[PDB]
From a paper:
α-Actinin-2 (ACTN2) is the only muscle isoform of α-actinin expressed in cardiac muscle. All four isoforms of α-actinin consist of an N-terminal actin binding domain (ABD) comprising two calponin homology (CH) domains, connected via a flexible linker, which allows for conformational flexibility in the ABDs, to a rod domain. Thus ACTN2 is important in cross-linking actin and titin filaments in the Z-disc. We have investigated the effects of two mutations identified from HCM patients, A119T and G111V, on the secondary and tertiary structure of a purified actin binding domain (ABD) of ACTN2 by circular dichroism and X-ray crystallography, and show small but distinct changes for both mutations.
G111V was only reported for a 31 year old male, with no family history of HCM. The ABD was in the ‘closed’ conformation in all the structures, as found for other structures of the ABDs for the second striated muscle isoform ACTN3, and the two non-muscle isoforms ACTN1. However, although continuous densities are observed for the loop region at residues 110–120 in both the WT and the A119T mutant structure, this region is disordered for G111V mutant between residues 112 and 117. For both the WT and A119T mutant structure, Val112 is orientated towards the interior of the molecule packing the side chain into a hydrophobic region. For the G111V mutant, the mutant residue Val111 now occupies this same hydrophobic region and thus reorients Val112 and the subsequent residues away from the molecule resulting in a more flexible conformer for this loop region. This larger alteration to the structure for G111V may help to explain the decreased thermal stability for this mutation observed by circular dichroism. The G111V mutation had the greatest effect on stability with its melting temperature (Tm=56.8°C) being 5.5°C lower than that for WT (62.3°C). G111V is just outside of one of these regions, and although this mutation appears to introduce some instability into the subsequent loop containing this binding region, it may not have a large effect on actin binding affinity. The Kd was increased ∼2-fold for the A119T mutant, and ∼1.2-fold for the G111V mutant constructs compared with the WT ABD. After photoactivation of a small region of mEos2-tagged ACTN, we found that the rate of fluorescence decay from the central region of the ‘photoswitched’ area was reduced for both G111V and A119T mutants compared with WT ACTN2, and this change was significant for G111V.
Residue numbers in the entry: 35 to 257
Write the structure that this text describes.
Amino acid sequence: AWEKQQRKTFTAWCNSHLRKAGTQIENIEEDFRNGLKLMLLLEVISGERLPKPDRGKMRFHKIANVNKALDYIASKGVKLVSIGTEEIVDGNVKMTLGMIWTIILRFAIQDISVEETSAKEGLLLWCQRKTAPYRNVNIQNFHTSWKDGLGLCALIHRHRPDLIDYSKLNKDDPIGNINLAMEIAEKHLDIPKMLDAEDIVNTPKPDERAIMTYVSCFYHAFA
């Protein structure tokens, strides 16, 4: 169930940046094979210029573009262990997801710094701080603590109490709470809906990379 969740969230996330450059992806397992939109994604999120892309359709042109992407990422202190150009070009689902996770981590999460605490840990602390007043919320992690929708509704309410009546909410309708939160964030905070509520609720432990990805948008939307 983790691939399904990551596929939705990572794609939605990539799309939240690609739109700023006039394009989208649809199918993440194929839409980065040629390197073109992968390079473009890196430009948008970094604000840096990558080398000019190769629009040739053969494998060798794709390898060149993907290497422009991966070399750039490695220039930003990202150690690529088992992510390989050939398999991105050829189309490996797992590795594509992992590569996009690595970019999300580096560019959406790594630089989050809260009370001398950075990255995942720093994002976690910010969440805990913003949700401390909410007795029906207990953020310990980026999976089970977000399952019931209240964490997300609390982050919204904390910054924008005008968008949500939090006191009406409870644990009884986790699918509704998540959708509510995603609807408000989409409509008012310019954060596309990146989670499938159904997947999140119906799994003992939802995917933490996906959850982190989405929660990082709230962090950036508010700061």
